[PDB]
Amino acid sequence: HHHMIVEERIYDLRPNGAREFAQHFEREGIAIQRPVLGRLIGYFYTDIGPLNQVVHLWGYEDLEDRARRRAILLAMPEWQEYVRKNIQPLLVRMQNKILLPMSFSPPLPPLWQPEDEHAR
Amino acid sequence: HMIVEERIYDLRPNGAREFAQHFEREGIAIQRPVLGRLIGYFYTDIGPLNQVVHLWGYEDLEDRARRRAILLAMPEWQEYVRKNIQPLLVRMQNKILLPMSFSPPLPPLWQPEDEHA
Amino acid sequence: HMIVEERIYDLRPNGAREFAQHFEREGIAIQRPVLGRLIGYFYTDIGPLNQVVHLWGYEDLEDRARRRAILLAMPEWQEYVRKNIQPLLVRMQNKILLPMSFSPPLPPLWQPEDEHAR
Amino acid sequence: HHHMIVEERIYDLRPNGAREFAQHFEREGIAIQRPVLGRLIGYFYTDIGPLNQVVHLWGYEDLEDRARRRAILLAMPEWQEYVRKNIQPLLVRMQNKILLPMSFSPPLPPLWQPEDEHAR
Amino acid sequence: HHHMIVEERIYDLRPNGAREFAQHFEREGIAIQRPVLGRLIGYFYTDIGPLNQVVHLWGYEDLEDRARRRAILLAMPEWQEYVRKNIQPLLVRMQNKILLPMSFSPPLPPLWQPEDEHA
Amino acid sequence: HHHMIVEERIYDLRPNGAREFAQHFEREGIAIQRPVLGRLIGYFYTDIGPLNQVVHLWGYEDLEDRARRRAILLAMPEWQEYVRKNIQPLLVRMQNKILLPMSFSPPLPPLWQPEDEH
Amino acid sequence: HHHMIVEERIYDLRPNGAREFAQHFEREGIAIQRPVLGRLIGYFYTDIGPLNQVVHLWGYEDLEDRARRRAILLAMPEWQEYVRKNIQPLLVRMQNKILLPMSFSPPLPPLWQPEDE
Amino acid sequence: HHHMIVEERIYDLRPNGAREFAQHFEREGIAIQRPVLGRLIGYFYTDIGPLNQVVHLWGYEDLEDRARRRAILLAMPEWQEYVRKNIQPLLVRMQNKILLPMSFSPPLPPLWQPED
């Protein structure tokens, strides 16, 4: 897997907040974020377990790759405003982990290309 | 209308190395053809340590129940767990995740050709 | 193939009184006929406080899926939750429980006759 | 509800211990415990959530009733031996809660009778 | 111990809230609550550990005694309003447990008397 | 309260371990510990909530007074061997907190005297 | 180490509040607090793990001097007003621990001096 | 701070296990580990809070240097056996966090040298 890593991000939201969260991301947010970060493995909300939670997993070639990409995203005024206006009010708690794939785990997703965005 | 189960096992200290070794040598060849859609199998490097995290795709919760029941009843799987994984386990939990509209689609079922390759 | 869903809600401090009042006055008449088999609806006196605990029985997973989908699509339920219950909520969790062989069978389905006899 | 109370007991077990736990109770333990305590509302193991967990709810007419029935159970040599031999090795953590029914919650299960035990 | 019990209540407060919580009980709240419940073993705030936390231990003869006295307290409008106005804005999370004394643990205090309120 | 402090120590034990724990401290443990540390406010085990837990509260003049007395107890071979033989096998988790009494909270108990032990 | 002690304070903040927290401390707050408490070993915010969290470690000669210095800090209206206006709205949860250094851990750092400010 | 990071590692130990833990690290372990990782900011055990816990903070120039140096330590048989024999029996739970220093936080300490 050549030092590939996966960041799992886990956000606890205000009660019944996941629906608006996903609405913002599908309409606006994921077009900002996915081209920059690159390799979305999955973006979910919880149905059974800890409720009002969003779970998303992103693949990077290594930690440096993650660092460079998250800094580019963080420096985007469009991203900053999008979060401030739409997502910030829904947040309660945030946690992340760095996950390393076992040898039989699937390979990294390919990088999101602008043709993928046009295909949505 | 796919669903994803996330299973989160906390292991005994420094037990992730052996845990992965058993699954590559023997365990995943039993488990993956039965459950069908492995999205990711990981161990933590930063955060809660000595933890393995695995995400399994199913068409719905009934599909999950049937497939897990098939696995659970296999003596090969039972023996595999007893002899190799059971002593490694400390805590287990799971959650059911629902993909957002832009999240990647339901993967194909693991095939015999995938194993032999 | 019976399953029981346990739902555990942590409320804002001292919020259970209003929570149960809403469900007595309005809420349970909406929810219980749809979901079908209430096993119990409680609040805590010892343990984690400002917590409500409710268990709902279903014949199977698909029975749960269909009945919860009906409930959540009802605009009367959506508005009830939003106006009365959502401001009292702090945290929500649920578990899927499977009954051991000796555990009681499912309650019968809630009938209009039951609602009328309240 | 005439001061009715419900005790929820939540036991976390050794990994994959619920099967043996259930076996011991269906074969032997519940025949001891249910007639003494009186009103089993439900006895479960988890399938989604915290795994290796058993959840059981017992109904009592009031706090005196619960104390009296539990004291009788704890004093029984048969119960003490059954727990020590069969259940004690499977236990990791135990918690309980005292629950109060809302007005619309079902009434107490009837007391378990010998006629119930015989036709199990 | 003649089979007495102790209830430990643990309240997590909004940040830096314990000083005001303590002031409300010193000026007003404990005069309402302590004569009704009976036997305050201790009322504390945390300095090391979980911060912004108050811990209080109440003695009772048994769980039925506890439920009778707490019912009396909760029915009092003066208590309900004292809590609602002053304490409720400070609360974040609440928990309790029932503790049984070991045989060498001290006896539980006598009941709070009106002479104690006036002293 | 003259800067009085209280330490609450919370020990989670192996299941059904509190009975044996209490027996050991009744017969021998508390006779070593209480004179040295001085002011036992309460020593309990849990009945409802987190089960298999012991909770004990000790009063001190300050955190230095806590440090000196605990340092004395910890150095005692009699206490080291009692804990190793009888208590250590029963322990699962240990935590402690420093609590400050509110103005209306009772005063600290007096120092345990040898007369008390008699 | 002659009974040197370290206090670790752990604050969970409102989401995305660490940036404002650090800004208030770099511009105003740390100039009040550090000269009084004396020995800042580290002030951090989390990047991986529990997010929106600030971790800070304060060294003291002992718990008596910790108490004396913290009581001085807390009685300062400048500190009180700084916290009420700038930090209070950002706080969600606070915890602390008392840590004892192992023999090989770095020694007690020197007091922060006006020349350092 | 030039992208410096700090790793905080938090180990929960078996009851009363911190004394033996420290003894091994002072007698044998920290001689192995510190020269390799380079920048120990602090190595502690708890006295008040969660008990039977050791907390240690390691400085790194960035996560890339962290990964390089930890990979070097992990591959050392001397470290592997030291851990397996002496420390693993004391461990119950492990967690870690990546901490970023604020502008006023102390700088990256120097690398540990064989003279030290």
Automatic annotation (TrEMBL), chains A, D:
Family indicated by similarity: Belongs to the NipSnap family.
InterPro entries: Dimeric_a/b-barrel, NIPSNAP, NipSnap_domain
Residues in NIPSNAP domain copies: 6-106
Organism field: Paraburkholderia xenovorans (strain LB400)
Domain of life: Bacteria
Protein known as: NIPSNAP domain-containing protein
PANTHER family: NIPSNAP-RELATED, PROTEIN NIPSNAP
UniProtKB/TrEMBL annotation, chain B:
Boundaries of every NIPSNAP domain copy: 4-104
Pfam families: NIPSNAP
Family annotation (Gene3D superfamilies): 3.30.70.100
Source species, domain of life: Bacteria
SUPFAM superfamilies associated with the record: Dimeric alpha+beta barrel
Family matches, as InterPro entries: Dimeric_a/b-barrel, NIPSNAP, NipSnap_domain
Family the UniProt entry places it in: Belongs to the NipSnap family.
PANTHER family given in the database record: NIPSNAP-RELATED (PTHR21017), PROTEIN NIPSNAP (PTHR21017:SF17)
Descriptive protein name: NIPSNAP domain-containing protein
Protein's organism: Paraburkholderia xenovorans (strain LB400)
UniProtKB/TrEMBL annotation, chain E:
Protein name: NIPSNAP domain-containing protein
Matches recorded under PANTHER family: NIPSNAP-RELATED, PROTEIN NIPSNAP
Pfam families referenced in this protein's UniProt entry, alphabetically: NIPSNAP
Source superkingdom: Bacteria
InterPro entries the UniProt entry points to: Dimeric_a/b-barrel, NIPSNAP, NipSnap_domain
Organism whose genome encodes this protein: Paraburkholderia xenovorans (strain LB400)
Family: Belongs to the NipSnap family.
Limits of the NIPSNAP domain: 6-106
